[PDB]
Design a protein around this ligand. Structure first.
Ligand code: HEM
Length: 214
């Protein structure tokens, strides 16, 4: 539709299905997930969020992003640090992996926040609404499949403490996105960058699948 939030959903319908068919993702979707597979996903999320959040901070005051700037409600770096310390130990920062697919995703994030900030919204939208929408089912799948100790840590990433209602926050977020002022050219590029975002994820899964089954 005419609303960007609406245009984005319809346009990425295909890549979303593709992301779904991602072996690593479909397996996870079916419960087929191992500690090592999970650990790789968390390290992956950590590098992605460090880059994303780093770029969001860089453009927080820009009209092309300010409306969707939700630091308290959305930041994930801290939660992931808390999770990685659990999954990788006190020296997690020295052992977590940083694979080519992770780097490639990080690279496009920085390229966007630095040279194409008007498109950062596409990446924030893809990531945040992805993690906010399916986060619970995946977390749920995780604790049941991972059978982790009652340590009380490792899954903080999946809980957005500063968000009482995901559905309501989503409405607010979509409204903020639609409040953004952009020309048809930029809107087309943002739509296209959303797809690029899914593709980067899809290639990430593919890689983590090649790594896990080796
Ligand atoms: C097998 C895996 C997946 C399943 C079954 C799944 C399922 C869904 C479902 C049913 C929705 C709710 C639709 C809505 O109310 O808007 C949703 C929304 C969404 N998903 Fe996924 N998803 C999966 C993987 C992913 C991945 C890998 C990403 C991207 C990294 C992603 C990004 C999104 C986004 C951005 C939305 C927001 C849609 C909107 O604009 O309203 N999903 N997903």
């Amino acid at each position: 539709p005419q609303d960007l939030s609406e245009a984005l959903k319809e346009a990425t319908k295909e890549v979303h299905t593709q992301a779904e068919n991602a072996e690593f993702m479909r397996n996870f979707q079916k419960g087929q997930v191992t500690r090592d597979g999970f650990k790789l996903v968390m390290a992956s999320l950590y590098h992605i969020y460090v880059a994303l959040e780093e770029e969001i901070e860089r453009n927080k005051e820009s009209p092309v992003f300010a409306p969707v700037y939700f630091p308290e409600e959305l930041h994930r770096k801290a939660a992931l640090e808390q999770d990685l310390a659990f999954w990788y130990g006190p020296r997690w920062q020295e052992v977590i992996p940083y694979t080519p697919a992770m780097q490639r995703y990080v690279k496009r994030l920085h390229e966007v926040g630095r040279t194409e900030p008007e498109l950062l919204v596409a990446h924030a939208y893809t990531r945040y609404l992805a993690d906010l929408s399916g986060g619970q089912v995946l977390k749920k799948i995780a604790q049941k499949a991972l059978d982790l100790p009652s340590s009380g840590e490792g899954l903080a990433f999946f809980t957005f403490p500063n968000i009482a209602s995901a559905t309501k926050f989503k409405q607010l977020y979509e409204s903020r996105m639609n409040s953004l002022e952009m020309t048809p050219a930029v809107r087309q590029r943002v739509i296209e960058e959303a797809k690029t975002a899914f593709l980067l994820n899809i290639q990430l899964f593919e890689e983590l699948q090649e790594l896990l089954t080796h």
